[PDB]
């Protein structure tokens, strides 16, 4: 049985988001990719250079926003500047949210030698698509 990127069905009470509710064979059919760049095109290069940065960004943001992250990041790469879209639960005060976003928008830019934009959408709770 296929088990990659597949959340198993419990007795009928587990809340699952839209991204988790779809198997990997539904990519580009019902759900889109979590990241967009040019390294995965036909006549383009520098794919692993962007891939390692994507993985580092995923882990760094997961550690930076502990427990308040709703879904996975959306990493857009558009003309030397990278945008990070995140869905965050409204657990932290806005004073602490702004401190973290200001710290990140400078640390990531100085670490990757490229401008970084960070956008957060505050949700009251995790949005459930399928049974809960």
């Amino acid at each position: 049985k296929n088990r990659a990127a597949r959340v198993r069905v419990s007795k009928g009470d587990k809340p699952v988001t839209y991204e988790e509710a779809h198997a990997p064979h539904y990519i580009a059919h019902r759900k889109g990719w979590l990241s967009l760049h040019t390294g995965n095109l036909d006549g383009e290069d520098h794919a692993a250079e962007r891939t390692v940065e994507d993985v580092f960004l995923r882990k760094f943001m997961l550690g930076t926003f502990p427990g308040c992250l709703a879904d996975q990041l959306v990493l857009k790469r558009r003309a030397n500047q990278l945008e990070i879209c995140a869905l965050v639960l409204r657990q932290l005060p806005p004073h602490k949210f702004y401190f973290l976003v200001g710290y990140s928008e400078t640390l990531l830019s100085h670490f990757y030698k490229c401008p970084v934009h960070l956008h957060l959408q505050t949700v009251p709770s995790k949005v459930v698509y399928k049974y809960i």
């Binding site: 889109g32 967009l36 490229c114 959408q121 949005v127």
Partner: protein
Amino acid sequence: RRKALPPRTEKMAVDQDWPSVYPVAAPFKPSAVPLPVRMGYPVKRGVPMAKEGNLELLKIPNFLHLTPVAIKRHCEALKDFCTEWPAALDSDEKCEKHFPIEIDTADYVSAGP
């Protein structure tokens, strides 16, 4: 002390200019878009998910900053930088006689550092 502020939808004017709200590329923030858009695969009894908390809408690029009104307004201001093409070279028959040499140069753009 939790505070819940209503979005811009209740304050959006019917005739408010859209390029003023969306001048450049944006991550499609649901609070600034008064249009109710549902994206996602529907359920047997349910409906496609609304714009609030929808990751699919944030995944796709948004052309809200490139609406036709904004395109016209931007291109009108760019007429001052462009130059006029001479009408004496409308046909390539005279272009070959006047400038026989063709110079092909390749330019590329790629997202990244």
